[PDB]
């Protein structure tokens with residue numbers, strides 16, 4: 001989709017010209033930061049379930065009715081259960097992409113796009129997620145600059161959820 | 163469009179799964195060879211003018227019928243449009259290179275060009291030769307040992323050649 005690179009190659013093209021020096025410096029910086037972001041990405045990848053199933057309860061616990069209040073949009077069924085589970089993972093699997101990609105581009109085109117109508121139409125409370133997000137936001141046990149990066153895309157998501 | 167990083171993700175997403183250590187590595191390693199890739203794009207971008215001028219000089223000395231009255235490249239008018247063409251193609255390779263993915267190239271350049279020259283009655287095989295010539299020029303320069311920190315680029319250099327070839331097929 002859209003990354004610091006595609007960004008630059010885009011500008012040069014829409015101006016019908018070869019790449020600028022700046023744009024080049026840009027990719028460089030992109031690469032220079034990549035390191036931490038990547039390593040970060042892996043760490044999250046290696047802690048999928050521990051986080052998914054983690055934030056899982058976090059939402060089931062804070063908002064209990066979603067365990068009994070009968071309704072398609074509720075986890076009061078091995079179905080909604082599985083689904084609210086399917087969903088949670090999706091988000092995680094999306095923040096990593098962003099790290100590996102060096103930008104938000106992947107979330108924008110796969111999840112962020114049309115997020116409203118979707119939550120709307122299927123009746124899905126945005127807070128439902130911003131809660132689970134919070135969970136991971138502080139249980140990914142990251143430090144240094146890797147934590148910087150993750151809690152960056154994390155907020156971005158929260159942002160788009162409000 | 164897609165860059166080498168996005169590509170890997172797109173695929174991972176299709177199967178809706180996270181990246182396998184394999185994938186992470188592949189990518190991290192690319193970042194490693196980063197610098198090389200940039201001297202690459204830079205060096206080529208910096209000589210676009212020369213690269214062209216020469217591949218063309220060649221091309222026309224090789225196939226001299228295009229400059230004979232009637233030759234598809236006859237008349238300043240067409241000569242210009244020809245060069246413009248080349249430069250255009252090169253310009254897209256550079257993008258592909260920087261991206262480390264032919265995505266862009268194909269989409270915004272290669273796609274249906276084969277047909278284009280045909281409709282125009284432009285020898286699609288003679289356009290392939292002009293490209294080939296640019297690859298050689300382009301590579302010699304990108305991979306030149308002078309003025310740069312000695313190290314290995316054959317791989318990147320092969321990768322580049324691919325994009326060039328990829329395009330030269332699309333028309334021929």
Ligand SMILES: *[C@@H](C)[C@H]1/C(=C/c2[nH]c(/C=C3N=C(/C=C4\NC(=O)C(CC)=C4C)C(C)=C\3CCC(=O)O)c(CCC(=O)O)c2C)NC(=O)[C@@H]1C
Nearest residue numbers: 024025028197198200201204305306307311312313314315
């Ligand atoms: C294969 C192309 C040839 C080759 C390349 C080679 N280059 C480097 C290292 C560097 N390249 C740059 C260039 C840039 N960095 C940027 O941010 C930008 C954008 C403005 C550019 C153009 C830099 C700064 C370096 C490192 C410093 C240096 O010059 O030593 C290497 C070393 C790579 C590395 O350590 O990762 C190599 C091997 N070497 C060859 O022998 C081929 C002819």
Ligand SMILES: *[C@H](C)[C@H]1/C(=C/c2[nH]c(/C=C3N=C(/C=C4\NC(=O)C(CC)=C4C)C(C)=C\3CCC(=O)O)c(CCC(=O)O)c2C)NC(=O)[C@@H]1C
Nearest residue numbers: 059066072073074075080083084087090110111122128129
């Ligand atoms: C979990 C935090 C809360 C919750 C979730 C819940 N979600 C659904 C259904 C859907 N979720 C999505 C979301 C996406 N689809 C996508 O393609 C993407 C991008 C990668 C996203 C983010 C969609 C489209 C649906 C509907 C279709 C489907 O089944 O996938 C349900 C089922 C709702 C229903 O009406 O059947 C549930 C229960 N529920 C909770 O109780 C939590 C608080």
Ligand SMILES: *[C@H](C)[C@H]1/C(=C/c2[nH]c(/C=C3N=C(/C=C4\NC(=O)C(CC)=C4C)C(C)=C\3CCC(=O)O)c(CCC(=O)O)c2C)NC(=O)[C@@H]1C
Nearest residue numbers: 228234235240243244245247250270271284285288289292
């Ligand atoms: C030079 C290698 C050979 C050659 C070329 C030649 N090409 C044209 C005209 C066109 N070339 C293109 C190609 C592109 N236009 C674009 O915008 C892009 C980027 C996406 C590409 C790749 C097109 C569309 C044309 C037609 C319209 C135009 O001029 O832009 C000509 C002009 C022919 C004429 O009859 O006017 C020529 C001569 N000719 C040769 O002999 C070489 C083998």
